[PDB]
């Protein structure tokens with residue numbers, strides 16, 4: 001029937017511009033883990049689709065004042081897209097307003113440092129002031145710190161929320177640049193999936209340190225009650241069980257890694 | 261209103277008999293990760309409940325001939341329990357017949373050996389015949405091997421399905437005993453969660469080797485369409501985000517580990 005509108009986000013290696021994108025149109029402009037996953041889910045569910053990059057470049061948060069959702073979550077809530085296929089964390093507040101598949105990838109929050117930075121853990125970050133640290137805006141990592149009752153994470157949030165200049169970034173790439181350019185004086189808190197990808201990219205100057213701070217998952221999201229949710233969830237489980245999700249992770253993370 | 265009937269399974273450290281169980285009655289007979297999780301979910305959802313150990317001691321599989329489900333899955337499908345709170349793997353075939361929460365624990369299939377056994381991987385097992393290996397009956401690990409199209413896992417299944425004497429066991433404890441007693445000539449394929457627990461128990465003679473073979477999760481299950489599913493799923497996500505699931509994992513795996 002109708003073309004399914006897929007909201008997604010330009011986040012490497014999930015969705016990236018193809019080298020020759022300026023000559024290409026439509027879905028062919030893009031490549032990556034989520035582009036491949038969208039093709040697999042569409043094939044299993046039997047729909048045609050159009051990939052659309054979220055206008056505001058955000059994952060999704062609800063404004064405390066207006067109660068309005070932004071980002072990909074907002075695109076689903078307000079009826080501007082039919083499905084989100086992206087590294088979108090399954091969270092309580094989001095689950096209350098959109099539907100999610102079972103997870104297609106497991107992850108947790110992690111620490112990225114410039115190589116040689118003397119930090120091995122969140123506790124280490126929390127006990128010093130020389131090295132600044134922050135998170136992405138409008139996403140689940142920022143919310144993790146804002147809501148935590150665990151002393152070390154509350155201490156980190158109390159620092160981050162009032163730090164000057166701001167420690168928060170608008171995109172993962174801006175966080176990576178800040179780590180790379182800050183001579184060891186900025187560390188970035190981000191999901192293990194993104195951190196592990198970046199560690200395999202030139203110039204090979206970052207690394208993931210410490211254990212993950214939490215354990216959670218990304219899911220494919222649909223507007224609440226959409227008939228697409230049920231077949232999409234069954235497709236995710238099938239792809240998981242057939243080993244396809246594992247093959248795609250290796251393809252986009254490790255197969256052409258650049259750091260040895 | 262009505263007392264919720266919870267089906268569960270005696271699998272350490274998820275549900276275990278308390279030391280003084282012979283003097284105790286009802287839910288007080290039991291302790292463990294799933295006993296604590298049931299209490300937390302009941303508190304958040306506001307129900308009273310009765311823990312019941314599944315009669316046949318199985319997780320759940322569908323008989324190819326009769327199409328009848330056994331185990332905890334069968335208890336839900338046939339209306340004998342209201343909810344399953346257990347280390348029950350979220351799988352495609354189960355998702356088609358019962359509802360599941362988002363996962364409360366992440367895991368994958370793994371290899372348990374007696375210390376000193378010269379095996380480091382599934383590929384190693386598959387390329388030799390001196391060391392026998394098998395899985396639990398009536399569960400998701402056996403089904404993983406039976407359905408895999410990946411050459412190494414298909415080769416392992418072709419061996420396991422015809423091995424004599426049988427390499428399959430009825431309970432995890434029987435698998436552990438077979439590893440411990442077989443002088444290095446049996447290796448057991450089981451979920452990483454169970455393997456990591458057993459590695460911390462006396463006599464400290466087993467170990468987990470190699471990476472996990474897959475990535476998946478346990479969920480709380482309800483009969484399809486039950487009104488309990490929605491609040492239970494929101495409770496799982498809340499407990500996840502508050503760090504309670506992490507606290508319970510540490511409590512039952514590591515806090516009183518016996519092997520250093």
Ligand SMILES: N[C@@H](CCC(=O)O)C(=O)O
Nearest residue numbers: 059087088089139140141
């Ligand atoms: N996956 C996150 C974005 C990344 C982050 O917050 O670190 C989300 O869905 O909000």
Ligand SMILES: N[C@@H](CCC(=O)O)C(=O)O
Nearest residue numbers: 319347348349399400401
């Ligand atoms: N968690 C598995 C049981 C253990 C196994 O198969 O290794 C299930 O739900 O079937």
Ligand SMILES: [Li+]
Nearest residue numbers: 095096098099
């Ligand atoms: Li939801």
Ligand SMILES: [Li+]
Nearest residue numbers: 355356358359
């Ligand atoms: Li289901």
